[PDB]
């Protein structure tokens, strides 16, 4: 499995489902993630809605805001649900970057998500069965 491909295909899906074609953006993990993320957004739509309105996103503060939320999301540890929420939050910032006329941020956000998966979540994901376990548990 490829963390970068999973991030890239999700963002392209999230932005396309908001009417935007993201330029820079096995098959079962993408399908399972997109369904799990949609399920999470449905169940926590108010949190999704209020997260966009409270971001105060500028190119100067974008990374500090991304890192602060991701830090808090995994402060108490990692599970598959928080990983799904991690993807959904990354989608918020990408849609919000496009809405606020800051589409270049999508490529930076894609990189920050890939880095976090490669360097901080990778060991937990591998030790808890990898994405194979994720698709088995929820796909
Ligand atoms: C500053 C902040 C950090 C503060 C906090 C918040 C918001 N928080 C984030 C964490 N959150 C969590 C965390 C864990 C869990 C969980 O139970 N975990 S679990 O037991 O491992 C698991 C259980 C079920 C599925 N799947 C169901 C399947 C059913 C059949 O269809 C396919 C899917 C999965 N799974 O991996 O799919 C995994 C969870 O509950 C659910 C419930 N239903 C879910 N459906 C999909 C995921 C999911 C999680 C919700 C609560 C909300 C902030 C915030 C704000 C906006 C955005 Cl945008 C983001 C974050 C900001
Ligand atoms: Cl990386």
Numbering used by the authors: 9 to 33, 90 to 203
Q: Could you pull the original sentences from the published paper?
A:
They exert their pro-survival function by binding and restraining related members of a family of pro-apoptotic proteins—the sensors of cellular stress (the BH3-only proteins) and the effectors of apoptosis (BAX and BAK). Venetoclax competes with pro-apoptotic BH3 motifs for BCL-2 binding, releasing pro-apoptotic proteins and allowing apoptosis in cells primed for death.
This mutant, G101V, was found in chronic lymphocytic leukaemia (CLL) patients from the clinical trials who had initially responded to treatment but developed CLL-type clinical progression after 19–42 months. The BCL-2 G101V mutation reduces the affinity for the drug to BCL-2 by some 180-fold. The BCL-2 G101V:venetoclax complex crystallised in P21 spacegroup with two molecules in the asymmetric unit diffracting to 2.2 Å, with well-defined electron density for both copies of the drug. The overall structure of BCL-2 G101V was similar to WT with no significant deviations in α2–α5 core helices or α6-α8. The binding pose of venetoclax is conserved between WT and the G101V mutant. Interestingly, the G101V mutation did not alter the positioning of the α2 helix relative to α5 or impact the residues defining the P4 pocket. Instead the additional bulk of the valine sidechain was accommodated by a deviation of the sidechains of Y18 on α1 and E152 on α5. This conformational change in E152 in the BCL-2 G101V structure causes a small repositioning of the venetoclax 4DM and chlorophenyl moieties in the P2 pocket, moving on average 0.25 Å closer to L137 in the α4 helix, i.e. more similar to the BCL-2 WT complexes with ABT-263 and compound 1. Thus the functional consequences of the G101V mutant are felt in the P2 pocket via the ‘knock-on’ effect of E152 repositioning forced by the additional bulk of the valine sidechain.
